[PDB]
Design an enzyme around this catalytic site. Structure first.
Site, PDB file in Angstrom:
ATOM      1  N   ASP D   8      38.572  47.143  45.376  1.00 45.58           N
ATOM      2  CA  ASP D   8      38.207  47.255  43.967  1.00 45.58           C
ATOM      3  C   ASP D   8      38.907  48.434  43.305  1.00 45.58           C
ATOM      4  O   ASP D   8      39.442  48.306  42.199  1.00 45.58           O
ATOM      5  CB  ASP D   8      36.689  47.392  43.828  1.00 45.58           C
ATOM      6  N   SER D  33      39.490  52.548  39.047  1.00 46.70           N
ATOM      7  CA  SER D  33      38.146  52.330  39.581  1.00 46.70           C
ATOM      8  C   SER D  33      37.527  51.169  38.809  1.00 46.70           C
ATOM      9  O   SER D  33      37.084  51.340  37.668  1.00 46.70           O
ATOM     10  CB  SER D  33      37.294  53.591  39.471  1.00 46.70           C
ATOM     11  N   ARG D  34      37.501  49.986  39.429  1.00 52.01           N
ATOM     12  CA  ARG D  34      36.965  48.809  38.753  1.00 52.01           C
ATOM     13  C   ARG D  34      35.467  48.944  38.506  1.00 52.01           C
ATOM     14  O   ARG D  34      34.963  48.515  37.462  1.00 52.01           O
ATOM     15  CB  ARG D  34      37.267  47.548  39.564  1.00 52.01           C
ATOM     16  N   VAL D  35      34.736  49.523  39.461  1.00 48.69           N
ATOM     17  CA  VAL D  35      33.307  49.750  39.260  1.00 48.69           C
ATOM     18  C   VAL D  35      33.086  50.683  38.076  1.00 48.69           C
ATOM     19  O   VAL D  35      32.234  50.434  37.215  1.00 48.69           O
ATOM     20  CB  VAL D  35      32.662  50.302  40.543  1.00 48.69           C
TER      21      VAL D  35
END
Lengths: 261, 59, 236, 85, 132, 118
Positions: D8, D33-35
């Site tokens: 991710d 940072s996809r989150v």
């Protein structure tokens, strides 16, 4: 060469382009100021050729330049001009205005120089600072004593080519007497010799410094255009090299796939 | 009046005249050029044979 | 869904780059001596078999919205170029725009459309889109000089254009009904006619006095003035 | 490319920032940072939104910091804030 | 030559350059000089004051901040200038009076500064008289 | 905690200077060294002086470099580089740091070049 290509494209090409652009924006304003001051300069020069005030027969050298850091060749040209003038006569109190011309004078004739002024080439010329500089120069150095005063300042013809044009300075000695001082009515009680001497020392130096700023930023535009061309052709050849290398990766993967598999 | 004798010089006469003309004017007349005229930072320094910088006193 | 039901359907490819990567991968497991592009010899065959099957047949229409992932702009590799050949309208989502605050991140000048013409989308729609694109192009064209020099010296016409372009750029960001778990702002389902009308009204200068923050993270022009009132209340 | 496409988030430690002494030299320009702020402290999210905005501005103006010419007051302030951060 | 070709120039914005003009009344070093046509050539400084320029237009008050009464034999008078004077916008009293009073109050500095303060006071009085 | 805080700071600062030099290599190359800020120019000069100082004659390479292979202790190197980073030897030409050992060798070479050049 990825980092090299990046620093070539976005760190020495595009920002150099926009800095040439801001140099041109400054060039427009400085050209307006230069023509405005050149109006009275043309008036003064035509008056002086109408009334010959040539000085016959203790020398002054004034190094007038902006604060730009050797934008290609204008500072080297001014340095070589003042070097030649010093070779002609090395017995003058050199006054330097700027930083690059200041260190050039320091490295050429440290003994002759006795006055340096900093914080001048910040922006377009202002009359008050130039007049105050003239007052200081005529007070501490007493330019009236020297029959001849030399001011160094570059002149661009239209855009690119520059020359170290110098304009003679007429002292009160050559104003109180001259071959053709009788043409123009004067008032002895008004002390017009010294008045005109100080007025020309102010106007000629102010417009000389304005023209030097204009020539300095024109040479800055030319030097940044040369740097932009260097960045462009370097980027072209290095992009050809980048394409060659990235295609060579394809050749390498082709050879190891048809050998291994 | 007494610029030649008691005053600094004729250049100081023009300096004070221009400063009075620029400063003592209307609020809308204080343009960018007037701002540059008011702002002076000529830090002249007296060098020597050994490049002894006396002081960068303001103009 | 297209053939038997006879209805317009929406095909959504998650990542065409991952599809071609998996094709080259399964080529790597088998013999499949890579010759076509370098990593997959079949890639042309199955790639055309896939793309050609999405076609507006006489039964229905299938719109294929594929997402292309470019790793550090690897345009030299044939894989992104192959996807560049298939599509007709691009919606590139450059990260730099999202870093500024417009999280949709779609580049106004790099997201071209084949059917963006007065004959298809409409004369008013095409004119508004072209004028907005020109204004934003002038925005990023003069951004470098504004950064290196400043705003005051810029010409008044260019000042108006850059202000309107900033307002439009803030207007580009829109609440997503699917993004409430991260933003918390309820989504705004705008209409194409409403979008064109709002963009034309904003570009016409009728809302130049409204702060640029009002256009940010809103839907229609009514939402623009609502956020303007909200930010005016918050500021004072 | 495979690992970037799988995970991710991709934290980018490039040696150029380390040679500049950033230490650990996280290339925020390339780090992803996809989150994102979803799994983050709310106060940390509040400060980090402005932090990311200021680092993005500094990155898109960082060239003039190397140039060090006569820049705009707002641009100079943004550059100072970015280098201080 | 008929009339005069006034060259009114400024370091920031020139006013005239070879323009037809009837009267160029300007504040000479001693007083003020009236120039009509083919005036005798002369070189002499100008104190600050109104440079009255009669042309085809209406009355035009042009207060000067420094220049020379440089006249050519060919009637091409060139009045150099530093600061311009709008006909009505420049005329103000409150700021001028406040600055004059402040400078008079701070005029008790050293002799080098005292001469400058006295000259500033005299030019402020000249401005006040010019205000009318 | 291994080489000491002073040694770590000196190493970090010299790395910073040399990295500034590498980053501004192209700037010096085609944009122009004189067309640079005062602080950047000073850092570039310090980095060049450091790179010249990194040269050290080797006893096994005495026939190669032509200079006797003197050795330098770690504390002496740390002190000399800390003094150099402070700018105490900015006026000294870059060639003085060429093929020398400690700071004593640097000042000796500077004196000898000043004497021979006058």
């Amino acid at each position: 060469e990825v980092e090299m290509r990046l620093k070539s494209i976005n760190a020495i090409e595009k920002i150099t382009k926009t800095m040439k652009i801001v140099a041109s924006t400054r060039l427009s304003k400085a050209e307006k100021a230069k023509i405005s001051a050149k109006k009275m300069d043309e008036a003064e020069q035509l008056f002086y050729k109408n009334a010959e005030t040539k000085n016959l027969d203790k020398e002054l050298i004034v190094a007038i330049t902006s604060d730009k850091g050797l934008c290609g060749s204008i500072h080297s040209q001014l340095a070589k001009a003042v070097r030649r003038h010093l070779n002609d006569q090395p017995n003058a109190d050199i006054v330097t205005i700027g930083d690059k011309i200041k260190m050039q004078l320091l490295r050429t004739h440290p003994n002759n120089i006795k006055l340096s002024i900093n914080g001048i080439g910040k922006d377009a010329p202002t009359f008050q600072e130039s007049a105050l500089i003239a007052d200081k120069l005529l007070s501490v150095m007493k330019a009236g004593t020297y029959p001849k005063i030399s001011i160094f300042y570059n002149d661009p013809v239209s855009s690119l080519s520059f020359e170290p044009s110098e304009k003679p300075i007429f002292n009160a000695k050559t104003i109180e007497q001259s071959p053709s001082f009788g043409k123009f009515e004067i008032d002895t009680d008004a002390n017009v010799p010294r008045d005109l001497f100080e007025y020309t020392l102010a106007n000629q130096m102010l417009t000389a410094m304005a023209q030097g700023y204009a020539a300095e930023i024109s040479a800055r535009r030319n030097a940044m255009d040369n740097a932009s061309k260097n960045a462009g052709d370097m980027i072209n050849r290095y992009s050809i090299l980048y394409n060659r290398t990235r295609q060579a990766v394809i050749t390498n993967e082709l050879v190891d796939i048809i050998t291994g598999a | 009046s007494a610029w030649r004798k008691a005053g600094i010089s004729y250049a100081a006469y023009l300096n004070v005249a221009a400063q009075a003309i620029r400063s003592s004017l209307k609020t809308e007349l204080q343009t960018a050029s007037v701002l540059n005229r008011s702002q002076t930072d000529a830090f002249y320094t007296q060098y020597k044979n050994g490049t002894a910088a006396s002081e960068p006193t303001p103009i | 869904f297209r053939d038997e039901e006879g209805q317009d359907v929406l095909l959504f490819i998650d990542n065409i780059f991952r599809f071609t990567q998996a094709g080259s991968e399964v080529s790597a497991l088998l013999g499949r001596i890579p010759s076509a592009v370098g990593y997959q010899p079949t890639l042309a065959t199955d790639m055309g078999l896939l793309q050609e099957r999405i076609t507006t047949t006489k039964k229905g229409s299938v719109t294929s919205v594929q997402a292309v992932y470019v790793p550090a702009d690897d345009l030299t590799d044939p894989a992104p170029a192959t996807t560049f050949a298939h599509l007709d309208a691009t919606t590139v989502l450059s990260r730099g725009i999202s870093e500024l605050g417009i999280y949709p991140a779609v580049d106004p000048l790099d997201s071209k459309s084949r059917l963006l013409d007065a004959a298809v989308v409409g004369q008013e729609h095409y004119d508004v889109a072209s004028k907005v694109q020109e204004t934003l192009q002038t925005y990023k064209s003069l951004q470098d000089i504004i950064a290196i020099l400043g705003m005051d010296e810029l010409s008044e016409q260019d000042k108006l254009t850059v202000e309107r372009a900033r307002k439009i750029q803030r207007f580009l960001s829109q609440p997503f009904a699917v993004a409430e778990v991260f933003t918390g702002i309820p989504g705004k389902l705008v209409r194409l006619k409403d979008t064109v009308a709002s963009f034309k009204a904003v570009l016409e200068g009728k809302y130049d006095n409204i702060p640029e923050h009002a256009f940010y993270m809103v839907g229609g022009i009514e939402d623009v003035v609502a956020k303007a009132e909200k930010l005016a209340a918050e500021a004072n | 490319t495979n690992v970037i496409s799988i995970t991710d988030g991709q934290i980018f430690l490039e040696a150029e920032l380390f040679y500049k002494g950033i230490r650990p030299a996280i290339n925020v320009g390339l780090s992803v940072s996809r989150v994102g702020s979803a799994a983050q402290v709310k106060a940390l999210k509040q400060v980090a939104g402005s932090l990311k905005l200021f680092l993005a501005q500094y990155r898109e103006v960082a060239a003039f910091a190397q140039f060090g010419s006569d820049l705009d007051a707002s641009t100079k302030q943004t550059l100072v804030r970015g280098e201080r951060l | 030559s008929s009339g005069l070709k006034l060259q009114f120039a400024l370091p920031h914005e020139t006013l005239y350059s070879g323009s037809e003009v009837t009267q160029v009344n300007l504040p000479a070093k001693s007083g003020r000089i009236g120039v009509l046509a083919n005036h005798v050539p002369t070189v002499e400084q100008l104190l600050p004051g109104v440079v009255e320029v009669m042309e085809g237009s209406n009355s035009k008050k042009f207060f000067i901040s420094g220049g020379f009464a440089t006249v050519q034999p060919d009637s091409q008078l060139c009045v150099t200038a530093i600061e311009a004077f709008p006909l009505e916008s420049f005329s103000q009293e409150n700021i001028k009076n406040l600055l004059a009073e402040a400078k008079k109050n701070v005029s008790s500095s050293d002799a080098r500064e005292a001469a400058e303060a006295a000259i500033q006071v005299e030019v402020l009085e000249n401005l006040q008289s010019v205000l009318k």
